From a paper:
Pectin methylesterases (PMEs, EC 3.1.1.11 and CE8) are important enzymes influencing the digestibility of plant cell wall material by cleaving the methoxylated groups attached to pectin and releasing methanol that are then used by methylotrophic methanogens in the rumen. Here, we present the crystal structures of PMEs belonging to the carbohydrate esterase family 8 (CE8) from [name] and Butyrivibrio fibrisolvens, determined to a resolution of 2.30 Å. These enzymes, like other PMEs, are right-handed β-helical proteins with a well-defined catalytic site and reaction mechanisms previously defined in insect, plant, and other bacterial pectin methylesterases. The catalytic triad, consisting of an arginine and two aspartic acid residues, is strictly conserved in our [name] and [name] structures and the structural equivalent PMEs discovered via Dali analysis.
The Apo crystal structure of [name] was determined to a maximum resolution of 2.30 Å with three monomers in the asymmetric unit. The monoclinic crystals of [name] revealed continuous electron density of the main chain in only one of the three monomers, with the exclusion being the L2 loop (residues 204–214), which forms immediately adjacent to the presumed pectin or substrate binding site of the enzyme (monomer A; residues 4–341 excluding residues 207–213, monomer B; residues 5–341 and monomer C; residues 4–341 excluding residues 208–213). Similar to other published PmeA structures, [name] is a right-handed parallel β-helical structure of eight complete coils formed by a set of three β-strands. This structure is maintained in part by an internal core of hydrophobic amino acids and some, particularly phenylalanine, are placed at equivalent positions or stacked on neighbouring coils. For [name], these include Ile36, Phe56, Val99, Phe129, Tyr172, Phe192, Phe235, and Phe265. The N-terminal domain is formed by a single β-strand and α-helix (α1; residues 5–32), which also runs parallel with the β-strands coils, while the C-terminal terminates in a single α-helix (α2; residues 321–341). Extending from the β-strands in several instances are solvent exposed loops that connect them to labelled L1 (146–167), which forms the largest loop at the base of the presumed active site of the enzyme and L2 (204–214), formed in part by two alpha helical half turns immediately adjacent to L1. In the Apo form, the [name] active site cleft measures approximately 27.5 Å (L1-L2) long, 18 Å wide, and 7 Å deep when measured along these structural elements. Conserved residues at the catalytic centre, necessary for substrate binding or transition state stabilisation, are identified as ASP139, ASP182, and Arg255.
Residue numbers in the entry: 4 to 206, 214 to 341
The structure:
């Protein structure tokens, strides 16, 4: 079996840091980095043709860093969203399994956006990975076409083309509050636990968060959640957590056969900048959402009018498309 292998351990490894292991890997070589138990306080930048990272399991291998968008850089500039990442995964194919990746800086009101993971590779596959943060925990590239704020995309891909990506998340746990899964990827989340933090404790109607903030094209797949558990953290007030708001106007995000509780807002999805702002070019929706406790069917007839009614035909389409992205990624 030919594969370039590197073993990271706190003691007796090839290296004691992940960064040094990444350096070791030649871009063009199919590689795997095994990472032993421990907490690795590092900011990772990985760009490779075909690499796999395998930790010792969720909360056994932990990659953590604490950069926030509001931080000041040496040159005087604000770090910004897209430089806050604990880990950047770019290149052609990346696989990550059996670890926690955390941005520990804190709530966005004091520290700004703070990515745990910047997922930029053409094809990304996360399995049994836990990702924690507050604002903007997980970015699934690509960026929108153009910025609305000066230097809004400052980061490693600001100059680059907006490459479409295909991402698969299986058995992951993802924690955050405001826009904590966002970007323009075609991304399927399967059998994931997705939890909005109780922002109200970390700081009219109080809004704890927006699970998604997609910005893809109306002709692409966008975010598909299937058989996931989606909810606020224990303590979140009723109806204070949205399934999404559209970061750009053709946002696509669907939840198929998911379990949810009553922390989820009655409107289900928000407009951008105000709850009841119309977003007629989004494809936002739920199909067969079940209550988490008793598996009884959820009915929301107070959803925003722009939220779609997923017919059985729409559902088979979304399922087939999610299925073909899964094949592309795992094939």
């Amino acid at each position: 079996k030919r594969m370039f292998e590197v073993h990271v351990k706190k003691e007796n490894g090839d290296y004691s840091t992940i960064t040094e292991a990444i350096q070791a890997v030649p871009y063009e070589e199919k590689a795997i980095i095994y990472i032993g138990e421990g907490t690795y306080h590092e900011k990772l930048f990985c760009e490779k043709s075909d690499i796999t990272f395998v930790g010792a399991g969720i909360d056994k291998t932990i990659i953590e860093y604490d950069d926030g968008a509001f931080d000041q850089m040496e040159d005087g500039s604000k770090m910004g969203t897209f430089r806050s990442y604990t880990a950047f995964f770019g290149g052609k194919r990346v696989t990550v399994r059996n670890m926690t990746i955390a941005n520990t800086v804190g709530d966005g009101s004091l520290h700004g956006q703070a990515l745990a993971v910047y997922a930029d590779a053409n094809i990304c596959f996360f399995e049994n990975v836990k990702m924690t943060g507050h604002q903007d925990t997980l970015f699934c590239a690509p960026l929108p076409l153009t910025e609305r704020q000066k230097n809004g995309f400052m980061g490693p891909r600001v100059l680059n083309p907006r490459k479409k990506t295909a991402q698969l998340y299986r058995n992951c746990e993802i924690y955050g509050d405001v826009d904590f899964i966002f970007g323009g990827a075609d991304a399927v989340f399967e059998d994931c636990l997705i939890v909005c933090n109780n922002r109200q404790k970390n700081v009219g109607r109080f809004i704890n968060g927006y699970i998604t903030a997609a910005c893809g094209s109306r002709d692409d797949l966008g975010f598909v959640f299937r058989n996931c558990t989606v909810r606020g953290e224990e303590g979140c007030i009723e109806g204070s957590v949205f399934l999404g708001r559209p970061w750009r106007d053709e946002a696509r995000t669907v939840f198929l056969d998911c379990k949810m509780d009553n922390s989820i807002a009655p409107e289900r999805f928000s407009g951008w900048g105000a709850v009841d702002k119309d977003q007629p070019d989004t494809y936002y929706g739920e199909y067969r959402s079940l209550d988490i406790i008793d598996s009884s069917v959820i009915v929301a007839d107070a959803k925003n009018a722009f939220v779609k009614d997923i017919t059985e035909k729409d559902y088979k389409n979304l399922s087939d498309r999610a299925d073909e992205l899964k094949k592309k990624v795992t094939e």
